[PDB]
């Protein structure tokens, strides 16, 4: 195996990376890496575009709930399960998308923006912390409020050399489970003394208190790694190349001509450039034919091509950056050159696979945990009543009572008609149901059925022709 | 002349904190300038006969005593500078080899190991000098002298004299058991373990009566290991001797280049395996440490860069330990000349 | 009774210090203001200034 050897001709005799765990290769440089990623996001055109694409495609304009408790396992009966689902969905709809924005303690974001910001933080930081608090002094029906914590404030044990159990400010038991996190205080003025607080992961009653979301890579990973470690260096170097090329082009274009003469500068520029002595500005009106004595001379400088093949190299670097980040090349670079229908559809599919994976993991898990945390409070406060004769209590079956599914925004078709024909053809056969085809457009089938059954009544009552879907 | 480094061993000395483990448990960190230990006499004068008329001589109610102690401070440190990084290390192949950066992360690692080992040695000597004798004095070049003096009766720390020396008296037809009983009569509470010293164990074992207590059909239940049992380890949990547990401890600490033995040349330490021991750790005095909010801890590590011309990234650990003995009369130390 | 470990005493010391500097600078500003109002001019001198 040449890979592990000296190399071809000794070229690899100095490439001996240490065999260390992921933690010992990530934690010593955590803060600097996070800071560099933030600097890239805040000051680069393409990084901001990538974050915007993440937020808009993974989550979308709306992130709607779909509750499906497993009634077979609980033995509660179909109608009771459906009624309980309807009541829970109505309660959540009234609590999640309110206008007063009381879901968040800071009173700044609704639920959809909270999901979007969580995906963003998971994009350029590789983790997200949502803290579920209480305000017993409040008079509202639901006193469970959530807060988003920046991963910077989950500091280590104050940066000192740490240990085995206490890693990166996340207290750990004998196994890999996490017991308690450390939270700091974000002080903008910069002079207040810092205070660190302990916030346990779970309350003694089993309720979720402080939430951590990320995707691991190896056996042990206390804190995650963002998607920029692959391609930061090329991004910064490309930005520097862009600025340097732009400045060089401006410098080369600035010096138009060059006067060579023997007389005084005022006289030489007076008798050649046409500037009047009555430095010296030159009027830009008309055409001029200067008269040059044998000593004098005039030279019109020529410059290189302004973009002598820089765009192709930009193309290569942007292709590399897009490959590293995950999105397609067209979306990141806005190039959209000439391409057939097949190439565009392949591009869209290759992006959408990754987008679906990310949505199914990060947003879905965060939303499910937040929804369960609210559901416990709703159940306890008798706002929602469980069916009787339950095989388990709510404590004994946490997921089974609230096994929920979420529907996000659906794809925007490249061909408007082909997708419609595909959906209709699948519906005509038995291969796919109504829910599957209505959900790909991000609509719930029950609402569509109710809307149609009131539309038929309105059309019948108003004196118009009955609709197509009405039953004769 | 190419090469390859097949094996690279490492040398160590016999080091295991037996005395700290057995007798000193339940560590109690404290944030205080000085700690207190309180003893109460508990001696009751006999009720003397009194005539039914005089009715006098009220008795004083008993009152105790206290003490105050101040924990010492210890801070080892090391260094690393770019000069040591370039050449090579004795633990990497001529092949393979690494960038200069990784050699620094290896040197810092071994420096951490040495710091923690030195602190552990200090703690162990701290404990052993407290078990053997009532008091110890922590002295250093820059550390002002402070001593800890638990109140141990002079009648303990018994040593042999011109009479009753085990070495001088005959090894046949004599008993050590009676002398052991007479010595252990002083300790307050039962005794459950004996911690020999290899020379002392060798002296004790050679008696003809001690062998006889082992191979008697019905006169005992004791069993030992007379033959060679442990040769490389620092501890030897040998068998029981009637009721007590026999232990031989040979642990080594280094002061200067040479290697020295903790237990001083054939002592014997009667004691209880459940003796009340205190492991007190003081408050670490470092401005950054108190910035972090850490106090009354042990082994606070840190590093920094000195912005000098040769640079340097130092490495430091601070402990401030102090081991106490709640009751100093539950041990009896015998010299065994 | 109810003592505090030094990690809290250090913070209390720090706050009282910072309040002391703020008061001193406010006092300097008032001293400049009064002289600027009561008279046209004022001199700004110090030992190392």
Swiss-Prot record, chain A:
Organism annotation: Escherichia phage lambda (Bacteriophage lambda)
Assembly and interaction partners: Homododecamer. Interacts with the terminase complex composed of two small and one large terminase subunits.
NCBIfam families on file: portal_lambda (TIGR01539)
InterPro entries from the UniProt entry: Phage_lambda_portal
A GO molecular-function descriptor: structural molecule activity
Subcellular location: Virion
PTM annotation: Proteolytically cleaved by the viral protease during capsid maturation.
Family as reported in the entry's similarity comment: Belongs to the siphoviridae portal protein family.
Main location (coarse class): virion
Key words of the record: Capsid protein, DNA-binding, Viral capsid assembly, Viral genome ejection through host cell envelope, Viral genome packaging, Viral long flexible tail ejection system, Viral penetration into host cytoplasm, Viral release from host cell, Virion, Virus entry into host cell
GO cellular component: viral portal complex
Function: Forms the portal vertex of the capsid. This portal plays critical roles in head assembly, genome packaging, neck/tail attachment, and genome ejection. The portal protein multimerizes as a single ring-shaped homododecamer arranged around a central channel. Binds to the terminase subunits to form the packaging machine.
One GO process term, biological-process aspect: symbiont genome ejection through host cell envelope, long flexible tail mechanism
Protein name stated in the entry: Portal protein B
From Swiss-Prot, chain B:
Main location: virion
GO cellular component: host cell cytoplasm; T=7 icosahedral viral capsid; viral capsid
Cell location: Virion; Host cytoplasm
Annotated InterPro entries: Major_capsid_GpE
Pfam family, one: Phage_cap_E
Keyword match Chaperone: no
Keywords from the UniProt entry: Capsid protein, Host cytoplasm, Late protein, T=7 icosahedral capsid protein, Virion
Record has DNA repair as a keyword: no
Role: Assembles to form an icosahedral capsid with a T=7 symmetry. The icosahedral capsid is about 60 nm in diameter and composed of 415 major capsid proteins. The assembly is primed by the interaction between capsid assembly protease and portal dodecamer, and major capsid proteins assemble cooperatively to form the procapsid with the help of capsid scaffolding protein. Major capsid protein forms hexons and pentons of the icosahedron. Viral genomic DNA is packaged into the procapsid through the portal vertex.
Oligomeric and partner information: Homomultimer. Interacts with FI protein.
The family this protein is said to belong to: Belongs to the lambda phage major capsid protein family.
Name this protein carries in UniProt: Major capsid protein
Protein's organism: Escherichia phage lambda (Bacteriophage lambda)
Taxonomic path: Viruses, Duplodnaviria, Heunggongvirae, Uroviricota, Caudoviricetes
From Swiss-Prot, chain C:
Entry's transmembrane regions: none
Subcellular location: Virion; Host cytoplasm
Subunit description: Homomultimer. Interacts with FI protein.
Stated role: Assembles to form an icosahedral capsid with a T=7 symmetry. The icosahedral capsid is about 60 nm in diameter and composed of 415 major capsid proteins. The assembly is primed by the interaction between capsid assembly protease and portal dodecamer, and major capsid proteins assemble cooperatively to form the procapsid with the help of capsid scaffolding protein. Major capsid protein forms hexons and pentons of the icosahedron. Viral genomic DNA is packaged into the procapsid through the portal vertex.
Family, per entry: Belongs to the lambda phage major capsid protein family.
Descriptive protein name: Major capsid protein
